[PDB]
Structure 1
Amino acid sequence: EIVLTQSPGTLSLSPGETAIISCRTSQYGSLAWYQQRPGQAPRLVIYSGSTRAAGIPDRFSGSRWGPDYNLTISNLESGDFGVYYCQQYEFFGQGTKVQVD
């Protein structure tokens, strides 16, 4: 019982490089992402698909074109890699993760 999804499922990048992530496919609604797990409860990164959230680094910005919806993930660090999620209202994504090194 799932409608929401996101791609790519898993990535393998070193510290400091940039990645491209995207949520799919066509269900209407406000998009959102929640930051990689640091160990405690995660924090926000973005509002309304393309609005940076307060108290967040400037490395990360979204983009939306109808069904197309991408997020660039730049200058990763060992202190920021982890399991991060995509969300619309109730569902969540498959739970992507970017592994450092």
Structure 2
Amino acid sequence: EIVLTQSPGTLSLSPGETAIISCRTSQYGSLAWYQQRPGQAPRLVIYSGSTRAAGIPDRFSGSRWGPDYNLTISNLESGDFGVYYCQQYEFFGQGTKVQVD
């Protein structure tokens, strides 16, 4: 019964403003987010719900609601846009993309 889900599918936003991404879950366990520009090696952003990876500003963070998770970002400049992926224990979410207006 372990299935993930991410929404919304894609974003087109002006730089310097927030965005909101949701990652659902159906099992007790940790969670982490990954960032991916096209081509390059993806990067870790946050893990264990709300703890934050080394070498990133405080733009990116979220809350562990329990049966669901919400990620929000603040003041996203044009150079930080890419593709987001959710994680659990083996399951990688459907993924979503943010693009610059």
Task: Give the drift of 1:43.
Answer: 1.3
Output the CA distance in 2 between the equivalents of 1:92 and 1:2: 11
Task: Give the drift of 1:2.
Answer: 7.3
C-alpha contact (below 8 Å) 2:34/2:45 kept by paired residues: yes
Q: Which has the higher strand share?
A: 2
With the length of structure 1 as denominator, give the TM-score of the two structures: 0.89
Task: Give the drift of 1:39.
Answer: 3.7
Output the CA distance in 1 between the equivalents of 2:58 and 2:95: 23
Kindly provide the CA deviation profile for residues 23-69 of structure 1, in whole angstroms up to 9, marking residues without a partner as x: 01322211000013264202111120100111111111110111121
C-alpha contact (below 8 Å) 1:4/1:24 kept by paired residues: yes
C-alpha contact (below 8 Å) 2:2/2:27 kept by paired residues: no
Output the CA distance in 2 between the equivalents of 1:38 and 1:17: 21
Residue of structure 2 equivalent to 1:49: 49
Output the CA distance in 2 between the equivalents of 1:26 and 1:59: 27
Percent identity reads: 100
Secondary structure of the corresponding residue to residue 86 of structure 1: strand
Secondary structure of the corresponding residue to residue 66 of structure 1: coil
Residue of structure 2 equivalent to 1:21: 21
Q: CA RMSD in A?
A: 1.8
With the length of structure 2 as denominator, give the TM-score of the two structures: 0.89
Structure 1 unaligned residues grouped into runs of 5+: none
C-alpha contact (below 8 Å) 2:3/2:26 kept by paired residues: no
Structure 2 unaligned residues grouped into runs of 5+: none
C-alpha contact (below 8 Å) 2:2/2:26 kept by paired residues: no
Output the CA distance in 2 between the equivalents of 1:2 and 1:14: 35
C-alpha contact (below 8 Å) 1:26/1:66 kept by paired residues: no
